[PDB]
Amino acid sequence: AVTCGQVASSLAPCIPYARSAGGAVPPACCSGIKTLDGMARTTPDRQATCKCLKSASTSISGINYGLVASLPAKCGVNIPYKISPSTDCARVK
């Protein structure tokens, strides 16, 4: 299964943008999102990713969750659902 180390390494370039008002996505953040997409191909990998993101969120303030929800589509990755702290990781498919 993908580790929290793997998730952090792929989405670390997204953190400064995740705290901003929006605008142009850093290419390294889109690259990071593509890498994470490539690692999370099973339900458990997506559930692990969800749990790693929620855990890291408790240690970071100033996050623009409305902007984070749309980041995949801005990076060319089509996603059925929005990334949300509200969503239970146990219900991620």
Author numbering: 1 to 93
Extract from the study:
Lipid transfer proteins (LTPs), also called non-specific lipid transfer proteins (nsLTPs), are known for their ability to bind and transport hydrophobic ligands. The biological role of nsLTPs is still not well understood. They transport these lipids between biological membranes primarily for defense, including structural adaptation, antimicrobial activity, and pathogenic resistance. We elucidated the crystal structures of Act c 10.0101 and Pun g 1.0101, nsLTP allergens from gold kiwifruit and pomegranate, respectively. These allergens both belong to the subfamily of 9-kDa LTPs.
